[PDB]
Amino acid sequence: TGANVTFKVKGTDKEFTVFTTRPDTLFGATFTVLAPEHELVDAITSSEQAEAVADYKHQASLKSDLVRTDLAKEKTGVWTGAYAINPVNGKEMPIWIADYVLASYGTGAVMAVPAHDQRDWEFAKQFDLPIVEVLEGGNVEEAAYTEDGLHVNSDFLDGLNKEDAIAKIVASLEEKGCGQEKV
Numbered sequence: 001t002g003a004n005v006t007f008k009v010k011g012t013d014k015e016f017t018v019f020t021t022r023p024d025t026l027f028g029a030t031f032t033v034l035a036p037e038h039e040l041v042d043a044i045t046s047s048e049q050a051e052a053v054a055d056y057k058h059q060a061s062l063k064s065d066l067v068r069t070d071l072a073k074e075k076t077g078v079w080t081g082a083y084a085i086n087p088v089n090g091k092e093m094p095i096w097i098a099d100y101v102l103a104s105y106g107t108g109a110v111m112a113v114p115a116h117d118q119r120d121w122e123f124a125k126q127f128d129l130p131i132v133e134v135l136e137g138g139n140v141e142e143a144a145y146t147e148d149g150l151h152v153n154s155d156f157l158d159g160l161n162k163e164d165a166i167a168k169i170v171a172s173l174e175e176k177g178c179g180q181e182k183v
Contacts, residue, residue, distance in 0.1 A: 003170055005111065005179045007032060007084040009044050010092055016040050016084075019106035019182065022113070023173070024165035027154040028134035029111040030124070031094045032084045033077070036060040037103040044095065046081020053078055053097065060099050068099045071119070075100065075126040087178040088169070089155070098123060115140035 003023040008015050018032070034041055036057040045053045056078040060068070067073070077098035084093045093111075100119055101110055114124030114131045121144035124131050131140050134154050138145025151157040156172075157165045173179030 002182060003166075003173070003179055004107075004182045005173065006087065007093075007109075007111070008087075009040070009095070010083040010085055012044065012082075014040060014044055016109050017107050018109045018111045020111060022116075022166075023169045023179065024151065024154075024157060024160075024162065025113045025116055025134050026086065026088050026111070026169060027157065028113040028115050028132045029086060029093060030114060030130045030132055031096055031112045033096050033098045033101050033110045033112050033120075033123070034080070035101040035103040035105070035108040036097045036099070038097070038108040040109075041080065041097060044080055044082040049079055049081035053080060056097060060097075063099060065102055065104075068102060071122075075119075075123045077123065077127065087173065087176065094129075096123075096127075114144065116145055118144045118146060120144075 002019055002021045004017050004019055006015055006017050077096050080095045082095045084095050086093055112120040114120040115133045116135055133140045134151055135149035136152050137149035148162050151160050151165050170181055
C-alpha cells in the first residue's frame with residue numbers, strides 16, 4: 001500500500017526509483033540515501049568523491065545486514081558527489097550512500113525525511129543535514145516525530161491528513177509520470 005517515486009540525478013541522464021509508504025512527506029525529503037551496493041552508485045559518483053565512495057563500499061560489504069540495521073550503532077556514510085531532483089518542487093537533494101540502507105530494502109534507495117523517520121533523523125544529526133517538518137505535532141530538531149499529524153511546509157498539501165495528502169500527492173505524480181502507487 002505505498003508508492004514508487006522517481007528522482008532524476010541532476011546534470012545527467014540517470015534516474016532511480018524509491019518505494020515509499022509516505023509519498024505525502026515528499027516536501028520534507030532533504031536528501032536521498034542509496035545502499036552502498038545500489039547499481040547507480042558508480043555511475044553518478046563525482047571524481048572527487050570516487051575514492052571515499054569506494055572505501056565506504058568496501059567497509060559496508062564487510063558488515064552483515066543485522067549489524068548494518070542495528071539502530072544503536074553510529075550512523076556512517078559518504079556523499080556521492082551527486083544531487084537528486086525532488087519531482088514536486090525541483091529542489092536539489094544530495095545523494096549519499098549509507099550502511100543502514102540495504103540493497104534489498106525496497107529498491108535499495110530511500111528518500112530521507114529526517115523529521116519523521118528515526119534512522120534518517122540520526123543520519124541527518126550525524127552529518128548536519130537539514131531537517132524539515134511536514135507533519136505537525138512534534139519538535140523535529142530534538143527528536144524525530146514518527147506519528148501522524150496535519151501537513152505543513154507542503155504547499156498544496158498543507159492542512160490535510162494522511163489519507164487526503166497521500167491521495168493528492170499521488171495524483172500529482174501519476175499525471176507527471178514521476179510516480180505511481182504499488183502493492
